[PDB]
Design a protein around this ligand. Structure first.
Ligand SMILES: [Mg+2]
Ligand SMILES: [Zn+2]
Ligand SMILES: [Zn+2]
Ligand SMILES: [Zn+2]
Lengths: 50, 66, 42, 50, 50, 99, 49, 55, 99, 46
């Protein structure tokens, strides 16, 4: 729900104002997923990681 | 994924409207008549149900089950 | 102005893994060719 | 700068001499006019003109 | 990437930070707002005296 | 008298009021006045209200008639020039050949 | 639309253009870009950060 | 062993970006700073089998 | 399928039917709380296949039982002497339909 | 006592506790997932 107006002067050069309560009600919520991995391998000599 | 509980803009409870909305649509209503029947007046609230995509139904088909 | 010796640069300006830096490869191939020509002329 | 996702760097001088030189020669208040022809650069901007 | 262009004439320094920028018209024209997180990392060595 | 605009507040040129302050009374006065303006203008404007809408860009009525007449006149004139050229009647402007 | 101010409680002096627009959030976030260095590892060939 | 208090409770620890070896009982710093190769040379790595490197 | 953080956020927004004029603000720390400044609910549901399902194997409302978690599965857990002061049925979620 | 990995296809509990190569006990699948933790975790509903 956008309103096109000048307000508070914290929106001068393409910055924009966001309503706090909408953010508290789930507006713009997001999830970030990241992955890590490891390998255990057997060497030529009969020895291995553990 | 799943219907949000409260309308973002004004804080009205819309989380309990999804099943009723689908039922009224199933009765050959139109979206306007269904939304007015449920009592959602402010257009900041009608978009909460008119523009929802129910991904949980499709996601659960890939979920593990016995 | 005509060269007959070369200073091999110190280790610190050519780290352990470039495994080793290419200047080391050039130096080793030069010395290899030197040994080849020496023994072959003899 | 225009606040469309831009980034800026920042340095912290580690000496009293550097501090004094930065403050006296690079101060913002001492650089209100550009040296090309002596015209102001730091003045009001959009939405302060309106 | 040679020595003269890349290393001697311009080089990397420490005690410096980078971040996005945003507006704040409640400051003077000679102040900048620094996050508390970055204030805790950069350090200035003060000599002790009377 | 007058009303303030880019030529008297903006970073264009001299006659800027902050420039006058800087040159006649010092750096501190200009730096103070800039912050005073930056704090005062938003309080007025954000409570007065100022917006742009589609109504501000919809064309008027008489503009449509004027544009229609202008388009017709220009197209007709162009057609007569091309007519003059293709039959050779066109007078060659004394700076270049006909094209 | 006729709009009433929320700080002063008094009507505004111009009708405000109001309505819904589709907004999308890009992948760039400030939390992933804040970075600062005081002292740390240095290269081997040239002892620079 | 910590040269200042002689205790053996040395712990390897890094501050925000600075790696160091700190006596966990008196706060002394015994060794700080590391020198590590970067990507600019990471792209150039070759291989020589040691058997080859040994003749 | 719902993540823990999203699920907790969703549970945060459910209005409760207690009277806030009979409780005090919880002091800083003391996460345990006590009977004078907290309420407790317990949610516990498990989904299982319906033993009496027909062969249609097509309607989710018949294949499974407790496949939808509504807000009516939350049970008030009295704490301290609250069981006497608040008569049965006064402490509950307001709406009872929220999915 | 031995630890349980859930098979990725039939979801039958399997115990390995050895260097035995990964493979399900009932089906042929070769992917396993750890069970959820038993400790409780506290979240803020904000
Ligand atoms: Mg930009
Ligand atoms: Zn609403
Ligand atoms: Zn010590
Ligand atoms: Zn299996």
């Amino acid at each position: 729900t956008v309103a096109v107006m000048s307000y508070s002067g914290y929106d001068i050069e393409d910055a924009l104002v966001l309503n706090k309560a909408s953010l508290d009600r789930g507006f713009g919520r997001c999830l970030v997923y990241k992955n890590a991995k490891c390998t255990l391998k057997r060497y030529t000599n009969q020895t291995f990681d553990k | 994924m799943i219907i949000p509980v409260r309308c973002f803009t004004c804080g009205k409870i819309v989380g309990n409207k999804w099943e009723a909305y689908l039922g009224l649509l199933q009765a050959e209503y139109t979206e306007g008549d269904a939304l007015d029947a449920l009592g959602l007046k402010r257009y900041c609230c009608r978009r909460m149900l008119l523009a929802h995509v129910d991904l949980i139904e499709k996601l659960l088909n890939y979920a593990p089950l016995e | 102005l005509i060269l007959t010796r070369l200073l091999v640069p110190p280790l610190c300006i050519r780290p352990s893994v470039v495994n080793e830096d290419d200047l080391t490869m050039k130096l080793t191939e030069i010395i290899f060719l030197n040994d080849v020509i020496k023994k072959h002329r003899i | 700068a225009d606040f469309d996702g831009d980034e800026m760097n920042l340095h912290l001088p580690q000496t009293e001499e550097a501090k004094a030189e930065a403050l006296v020669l690079m101060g913002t208040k001492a650089n209100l006019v550009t040296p090309r022809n002596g015209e102001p650069l730091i003045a009001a901007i959009q939405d302060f003109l309106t | 990437q040679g020595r003269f262009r890349g290393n001697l004439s311009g080089k990397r320094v420490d005690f410096s930070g980078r971040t996005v920028i945003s507006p704040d018209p409640n400051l003077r024209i000679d102040e900048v707002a620094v996050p508390v997180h970055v204030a805790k990392i950069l350090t200035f060595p003060e000599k002790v005296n009377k | 008298s007058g009303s303030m605009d880019k030529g008297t507040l903006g970073s264009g040129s001299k006659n800027n009021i902050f420039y006058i302050l800087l040159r006649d009374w010092g750096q501190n006065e200009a730096a103070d006045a800039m912050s005073r303006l930056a704090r005062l203008a938003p309080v007025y404007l954000s409570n007065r209200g100022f917006s742009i809408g589609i109504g501000d860009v919809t064309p008027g009525q008489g503009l449509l008639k004027a544009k229609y007449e202008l388009l017709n006149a220009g197209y007709k004139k162009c057609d007569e020039y091309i007519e003059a050229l293709n039959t050779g009647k066109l007078q060659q402007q004394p700076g270049c050949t006909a094209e | 639309d006729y709009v009433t101010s929320g700080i002063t409680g008094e009507p505004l002096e111009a009708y405000i253009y109001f309505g819904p627009v589709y907004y999308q959030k890009l992948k760039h976030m400030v939390l992933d870009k804040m970075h600062a260095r005081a002292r740390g590892p240095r290269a081997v060939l040239t002892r620079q950060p | 062993r910590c040269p200042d208090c002689g205790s053996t409770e040395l712990v390897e620890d890094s501050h925000y970006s600075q790696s160091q070896l700190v006596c966990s009982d008196c706060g002394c710093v015994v060794t700080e700073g590391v020198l590590t190769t970067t990507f600019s040379d990471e792209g150039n790595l070759r291989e020589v089998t040691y058997s080859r490197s040994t003749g | 399928i719902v993540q823990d953080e999203i699920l907790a956020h969703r549970l945060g927004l459910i209005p409760i039917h207690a009277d806030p004029r009979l409780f005090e603000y919880r002091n800083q720390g003391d996460e345990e709380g006590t009977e004078i400044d907290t309420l407790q609910f317990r949610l516990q549901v498990r989904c299982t296949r319906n033993p009496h399902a027909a062969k249609d194997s097509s309607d989710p409302n018949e294949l499974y039982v407790n496949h939808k978690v509504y807000t009516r599965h939350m049970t008030w857990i009295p704490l301290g002497n609250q069981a006497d002061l608040f008569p049965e049925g006064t402490i509950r979620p307001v709406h009872d339909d929220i999915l | 006592q031995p630890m349980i990995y859930i098979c990725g296809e039939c979801h039958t509990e399997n115990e390995i506790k050895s260097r035995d190569p990964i493979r399900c006990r009932e089906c042929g699948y070769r992917i396993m997932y750890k069970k959820r933790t038993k400790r409780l975790v506290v979240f803020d509903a904000r």
